[PDB]
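Hi R.,

Quick one: here's the Ribonuclease M5 sequence you asked about.
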Amino acid sequence: WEEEITFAELIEAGLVGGEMARRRRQRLGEELKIGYANGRQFHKRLKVFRISRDAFYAALAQVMREEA
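And here's the predicted structure, written out as tokens:
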């Protein structure tokens, strides 16, 4: 069992916002193989596909590393 990844958590992760956030969701969607989604759909897909916190944050760190 894991605590669900909430919409607030997606905001704090930088995945809800303007164009920078949209591009992050597209890159994270490719890495997690869930496709592009808006924030609301992205949140739902993480739950439907049972994406683990560890996998989500590993992919997020990789996406953020490429930004630097």
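The CA atoms of residues 13 and 60 lie 8 Å apart.

Cheers,
M.
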